[PDB]
Amino acid sequence: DLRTQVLDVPVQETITKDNVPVRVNAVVYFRVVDPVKAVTQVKNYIMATSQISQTTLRSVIGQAHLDELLSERDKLNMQLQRIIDEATDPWGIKVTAVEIKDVELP
Amino acid sequence: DLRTQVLDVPVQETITKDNVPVRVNAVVYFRVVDPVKAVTQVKNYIMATSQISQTTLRSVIGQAHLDELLSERDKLNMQLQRIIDEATDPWGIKVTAVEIKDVELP
Ligand code: NA
Ligand code: NA
């Protein structure tokens, strides 16, 4: 938990598959595990992790039905965690978990 | 617009009719129109208007399907405006409009 850092993914405004406008944010739980890769492979591993979290969130939710936002939160969180983890690995970072927090309907 | 005061209705956590948890807030647009009633009929006409806005919001949304939150926002706003206006009248206040702002799904 000590080296497990909390990242607040800035809010993402997109539309679901079934044409529903959603404002979504999330917390990323990530650990620095290869210092040499974190410091060599990218300029800034925090904001590198932030950027790809925002791009991924936008896409995963764009690719989602509203009913999945209601019923299948856990499944969506696993998709976010899978993808962001794959992304952060070249930078020596493990993503422990991803949790969608708020979901606003404007 | 000068005497039309903006009131931020504090967030209301409830469930829709079709069993959906919702966090909802709104702006109330209200005008003081009978000063004698505003000052006689109640201790504090702002917080009187706030309280009844929160109670009403909770009920109108409890009495709503999620699909009405998506599709029929305007209709829900008219219900809120009708009811809160009726409520504020004994206190010499006209409610110009009510607009649900944010709708969070926890
Ligand atoms: Na990773
Ligand atoms: Na009124």
Residue numbers in the entry:
A (entry chain A), B (entry chain A): 64 to 169
In the authors' words:
Stomatin is an integral membrane protein that was first identified in human erythrocytes, and is ubiquitously expressed in all tissues. Stomatin is a member of stomatin, prohibitin, flotillin, and HflK/C (SPFH) domain proteins, which are found in the lipid rafts of various cellular membranes. SPFH proteins could function as membrane-bound oligomeric scaffolding proteins in lipid rafts. Mouse stomatin forms a banana-shaped dimer, and Ph stomatin forms a trimer as a building block.
